Amino acid sequence: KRHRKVLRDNIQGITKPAIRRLARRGGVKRISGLIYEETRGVLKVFLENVIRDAVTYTEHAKRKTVTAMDVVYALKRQGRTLYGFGG
DNA sequence: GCGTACGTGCGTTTAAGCGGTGCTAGAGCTGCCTACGACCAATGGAGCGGCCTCGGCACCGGGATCCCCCAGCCGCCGGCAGCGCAGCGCCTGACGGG
């Protein structure tokens, strides 16, 4: 097809074990059940901040596709530089 | 010390994941044309310097809160000690039995 898109409930795509594994890499031993909801918001809260300016780069370039070279650029402005994709 | 809820484990189950199409959109590049920003020479007046004088603020002194504190004070009530007592089991009568 050529219309519509998946635009619902995708915040639940981050399934409960996925965070549970992620936190294990952080070394936390025991986690209460309440914390799952906050990080999803927190993860989202951080996220569009990265996209919003990333989107801004593309429109100034008058593209339609989002390149990785733009993604790192905004990540530089926010502060967290990334090695391994460009430069 | 209490207790719940989150780790551990088991048993579905399902959507990720793989591998496979098929498409065209959009990025990349080229050709070519234009305009617009740098450059140059002049010009004057906006901005910056130098004085320089009042009053907004500083300072004071005084009077005005106003929270902060707390013993006063009582109410309350429960503990507590004393008192009156309710109920029971035994004590002990009433009266026939032993």
- Answer yes or no: is A10 CB < 7 A from strand B: no
Alpha-helical segments (H) within A1-87: 16-26, 35-61, 68-78
Resolution in Å equals 4.0
- Answer yes or no: is A65 CB < 7 A from strand B: yes
- Determine how many CB atoms are found less than 10 A away from the CB of residue A54: 19
Nucleotides of B under 7 A from a protein CB: 5-7, 16, 25-28
Q: What is the DSSP letter of A33?
A: T
End-to-end CA distance of chain A: 37
The CA-based dihedral angle spanning residues A57, A60, A62, A65, taken in that order and rounded to the nearest 10 degrees: 10
Among all chains, which residue has been given the structure tokens 């070394």? A27
Tokens linked to A75: 């990540």
**Which residue, A80, A81, A79, A73, is CA-closest to A52?**
A73
The experimental technique used to determine this model is cryo-EM
Tokens linked to A79: 């502060």
Distance in angstroms (rounded) separating the CA atoms of residues A22 and A9: 21
